[PDB]
């Protein structure tokens, strides 16, 4: 026999370790076959200037196409013949490259990764070949309402800030982008301490630490002169951006109220809140009996196609809200239920309801961690986000302090009397007037 709590405390702790330059080493052991080693660099889109707005994202197309040591397709051939997978993901705050690989393959794994980060053989040919590709990706991203809309959100809740730029970047910055510019970018932002070398699975921390090729370090200050925040707050703005295209079959709406940085007691309590509203799709098997009202109403009244609440967490900024796709004629009704669910939440939460969401949270936050890749990303990202802690067993505790009054008071900071960030890609003809969505965040009636 064994009980949830117990299991919790029994989980392999994460070992954080440092090289001389600030290279961060972490790892969670299991003595299992496969391993996912990763280098989680934290110089994202938000450091880009208007020109290099898509810089980083451009580097990512070159990351895997050559090192001075390993030319044209020498990287791929190497990974492949091992049976290892190599992925590169980029965010507005975090770039990361990782490898999935047999545990015995660390040797040439970690070498590869390291290599990748540092030496990237980038010829004029590869630059002009990537351009064309990027320009073609851009065109394809315009084919995705959800991606089109979420960008919009950011741009309008971040209007007038570095953070509001697409990670994909400006069309024509791809055309223009000087070859010299990727260098300065990399050179200036890939310098650890930023970087973290993380990993999970069957490895021994001891060896990870050692394996780390100590080749280049942080060429930066020893004092406060550096302390000028490169992470300067980004002004919060509640505006809407309404891009109406009656040509399109459905309507995407992303509505948000600015939120806490990555670390904050209010930041877990929020989650528990969204557990309650939940998320819903044409294909949920419960429909009408699902315990979250927006879902039930939706399910019942054919109100919407799909809807999800989110919590986007940045160091100085946060996007909170949900997002619903709904026929041209149902934009207002779903707005009404949603906002309605928010207000009800900060005034009438009931312990039952908050206790169910609570438990949902735990699961969502345990099940994610199933698999090697998962764990690795939590460990890597966790270190630039929340610093060098791994709050995994704490969570249950923190999640445990949750009370219906805690949930209520935390939700009221952020939603109540606050000014929304709303964007849509019409049929938005029926989308509520900004003032109407505004007055939706306080309770006279409705």
């Amino acid at each position: 026999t064994a009980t949830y709590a117990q299991a919790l405390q029994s989980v392999p702790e994460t070992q954080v370790s440092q090289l001389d330059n600030g290279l961060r080493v972490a790892s969670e052991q299991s003595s299992q076959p496969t391993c996912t080693v990763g280098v989680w660099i934290d110089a994202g889109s938000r450091y880009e200037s208007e020109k290099n707005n898509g810089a980083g994202y451009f580097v990512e197309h070159l990351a895997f196409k050559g090192t001075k040591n390993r030319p044209g397709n020498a990287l791929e051939k190497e990974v492949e013949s091992m049976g290892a997978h190599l992925n590169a993901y980029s965010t507005r705050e975090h770039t990361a490259y990782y490898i999935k690989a047999l545990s015995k393959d660390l040797p040439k794994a970690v070498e590869l990764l390291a290599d990748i980060v540092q030496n990237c053989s980038l010829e004029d040919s590869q630059i002009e070949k990537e351009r064309d590709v990027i320009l073609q990706e851009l065109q394809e991203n315009d084919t995705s309402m959800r991606d089109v809309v979420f960008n919009y959100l950011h741009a309008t809740a971040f209007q007038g800030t570095p953070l509001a730029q697409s990670v994909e970047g400006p069309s024509e910055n791809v055309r223009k982008l000087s070859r010299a510019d990727l260098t300065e970018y990399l050179s200036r932002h890939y310098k650890a301490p930023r970087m973290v070398l993380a990993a999970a699975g069957g490895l021994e921390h001891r060896q990870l630490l050692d394996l780390a090729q100590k080749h280049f370090s942080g060429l930066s200050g020893t004092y406060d002169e550096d302390a000028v925040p490169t992470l300067s707050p980004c002004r919060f703005t509640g505006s809407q951006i309404c891009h109406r295209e009656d040509g399109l079959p459905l309507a995407h709406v992303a509505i948000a109220v600015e939120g806490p940085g990555w670390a904050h007691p209010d930041n877990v309590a929020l989650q528990v809140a969204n557990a309650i509203i939940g998320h819903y799709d044409c294909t949920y098997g419960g429909g009408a009996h699902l315990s979250s009202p927006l879902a039930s109403i939706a399910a019942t009244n054919k109100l919407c196609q799909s809807f999800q609440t989110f919590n986007i967490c940045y160091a100085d900024t946060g996007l909170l809200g949900a997002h619903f796709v709904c026929d041209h004629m149902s934009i207002d009704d779903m707005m009404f239920v949603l906002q309605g669910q928010w207000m009800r939440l900060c005034t009438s939460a009931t312990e039952s309801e908050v206790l169910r969401g609570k438990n949902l949270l735990r699961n969502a936050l345990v099940s994610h961690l199933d698999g090697t890749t998962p764990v690795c990303e939590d460990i890597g990202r966790s270190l630039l986000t929340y610093g060098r802690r791994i709050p995994l067993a704490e969570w249950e505790s923190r999640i445990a302090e949750v009370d219906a009054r805690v949930v209520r008071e935390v939700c009221s900071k952020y939603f109540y009397d606050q000014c929304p960030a709303v964007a849509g890609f019409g049929p938005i003809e029926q989308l509520p007037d900004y003032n109407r969505i505004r007055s939706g965040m306080f309770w006279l009636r409705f």
Partner: peptide, 22 residues
Amino acid sequence: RNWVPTAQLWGAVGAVGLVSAT
């Protein structure tokens, strides 16, 4: 829940209203 404290300030408003207004 919040209804007592809200019903109590709604209570008060009516009262002060009458009192004054009347």
